[PDB]
């Protein structure tokens, strides 16, 4: 390709009636910067009209609309694909070039756009129009189940995926999507290894995607209190071996170092996790994983700013702007006034999309008690505040009652709430104290204002 | 059918699973396996 580039830089300057030179330009530049391919097809479109009145072949308008489909010019790519269809339809004598296949690819990109254009129905219908004419196509059959997978992992999505595998079992994408099915319900933790070791045969082998999916399903087994039973350490070492293997065969595999740093962080080697995650960040910080792992390293310094900055950055996407796990990661070192009082707000925002979780209803009570004792212990606080603190304490006590009746917990029994209830009772006694303090300060301020008013009467 | 070989032969797919897992940057493993071994040597 370097030689092709250097030859194209020689044909680009001189003009020996260049006609297809920009085509060969864009044919290389579609891996490189997408704008260069666009500029080449833009000039190639008009260069094909001066010699004769000849319409643009559908293949170029198709490739240019496929370029624009990766961009935000989705409607413009849509017009390109429409025009490619109309043009490829006009090719009644191009049976050698198979105008039909050109229309096929154009319609595929068009349904992929409608899928992407918030118009799942048009994508469904176009994909079915390919099915009705060519059921031997895979991606039309897969993207259809993808659309239904939005509504749920149990609709004909799953069926069409399996059926796709039966027609083409040697299709690594369909198979990977199979294993992706089990990732919804992680109850198939250990049993996924069999389904993942199917196409690990040497004809497929060096499939880094399977190897990493293996290390991921193996990493999920970490974060267990059974580490002292010499059980999680072996799992760590095994996943580390997987990662070292996918490293030797792919030094650029950023997910390999991603999991290496994950296991190092589980080792508590957060600085070794820090800088490996930093190298991942340098290579591509965009991936959702780094915004979490890096923030979880920065928050581990107990002092943090970047952590909440990175938590904000990952939530910028529309995927889960309302999110519980991010606030559970963030609800840490909650003792600063802007951490206590603000984290109530973010806990409420999370709970208003997920009120059924026990952990939100528990942490909101813990932060309530943290604040209430931050003003009902010693503080010469504002007067209104001691009225408000007993209200918050009452609601905390109500939650403490309500939580105790719930059966299921965060994989950890909440039987230890008795100490929260005791803290509640003694904070109530401190409230009954500090409201006396409140009245004494009230009379103090009243006599202060009176003794000032008299001075003004003197003047 | 021929529609399969008609399309799979002209298609010019540029990205795939592995190309996402690979860094496009110059971070090979010389700067990665180094610390990976050093921390094992601390143990």
């Amino acid at each position: 390709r370097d030689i092709a580039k250097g030859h194209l830089k020689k044909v680009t300057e001189q003009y020996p009636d260049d006609v297809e030179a920009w085509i060969e330009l864009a044919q290389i530049l579609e891996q490189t910067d997408i704008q260069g391919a666009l500029s080449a097809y833009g000039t190639a479109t008009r260069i094909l009209q001066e010699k004769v009145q000849a319409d643009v072949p559908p293949e170029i308008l198709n490739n240019v609309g496929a370029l624009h489909f990766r961009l935000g010019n989705l409607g413009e790519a849509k017009k390109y694909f429409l025009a490619s269809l109309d043009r490829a339809k006009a090719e009644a004598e191009h049976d050698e070039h198979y105008y039909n296949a050109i229309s096929v690819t154009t319609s595929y990109n068009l349904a992929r756009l409608y899928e992407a254009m918030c118009e799942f129905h048009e994508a469904e219908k176009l994909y079915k129009n390919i099915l009705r004419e060519h059921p031997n196509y895979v991606d039309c059959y897969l993207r259809l189940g993808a659309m239904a997978r939005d509504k749920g992992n149990f609709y004909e999505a799953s069926d069409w995926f399996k059926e796709a595998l039966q027609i083409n079992q040697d299709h690594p994408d369909a198979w990977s999507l199979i294993g992706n099915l089990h990732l919804a319900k992680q109850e198939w933790g250990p049993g996924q290894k069999k389904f993942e070791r199917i196409l690990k045969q040497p004809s497929t082998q060096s499939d880094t995607y399977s190897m990493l999916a293996l290390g991921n399903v193996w990493l999920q087994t970490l974060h267990q209190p059974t580490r002292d039973r010499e059980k999680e350490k072996r799992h760590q070492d095994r996943a580390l071996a997987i990662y070292k293997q996918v490293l030797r065969n792919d030094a650029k595999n950023l997910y390999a170092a991603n999991g290496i740093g994950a296991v190092l962080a589980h080792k508590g080697y957060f600085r070794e996790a820090r800088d490996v995650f930093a190298q991942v960040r340098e290579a591509t910080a965009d991936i959702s994983d780094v915004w979490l792992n890096l923030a979880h390293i920065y928050v581990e310094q107990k002092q943090y700013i970047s952590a909440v900055q990175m938590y904000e950055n990952c939530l910028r996407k529309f995927y889960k702007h309302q999110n519980t796990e991010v606030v559970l990661y963030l609800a840490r070192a909650l003792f600063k006034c802007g951490k206590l009082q603000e984290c109530k707000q973010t806990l409420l925002k999370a709970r208003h999309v997920a009120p059924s979780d026990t952990v939100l209803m528990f942490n909101v009570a813990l932060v309530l008690q943290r604040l209430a004792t931050s003003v009902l212990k010693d503080e010469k606080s504002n007067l209104k505040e001691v009225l408000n603190a007993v209200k918050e304490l009452e609601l905390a006590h109500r939650y403490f009652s309500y939580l105790s009746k719930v059966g299921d917990k965060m994989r950890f029994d909440l039987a230890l709430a008795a100490t929260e209830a005791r803290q509640c009772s003694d904070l109530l006694s401190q409230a009954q104290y500090h409201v006396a303090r409140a009245r004494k300060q009230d009379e103090e301020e009243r006599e202060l204002r009176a003794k000032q008013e008299q001075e003004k009467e003197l003047l | 059918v021929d529609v399969t070989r008609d399309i799979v032969s002209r298609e010019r797919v540029w990205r795939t699973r592995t190309t996402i897992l690979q860094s496009t940057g110059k971070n090979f493993s010389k700067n990665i396996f180094a610390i990976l071994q050093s921390v094992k040597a601390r143990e």
């Binding site: 579609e30 990493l219 740093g261 994983d289 979490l292 008690q369 803290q423 | 002209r10 010019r12 990205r15």
Partner: peptide
Amino acid sequence: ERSGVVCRVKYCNSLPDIPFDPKFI
């Protein structure tokens, strides 16, 4: 307070989906 906030802090990393590239020709 007697404890910090309870948290199942786990260093997770997902995998990407198949890119389903547009079929350039």
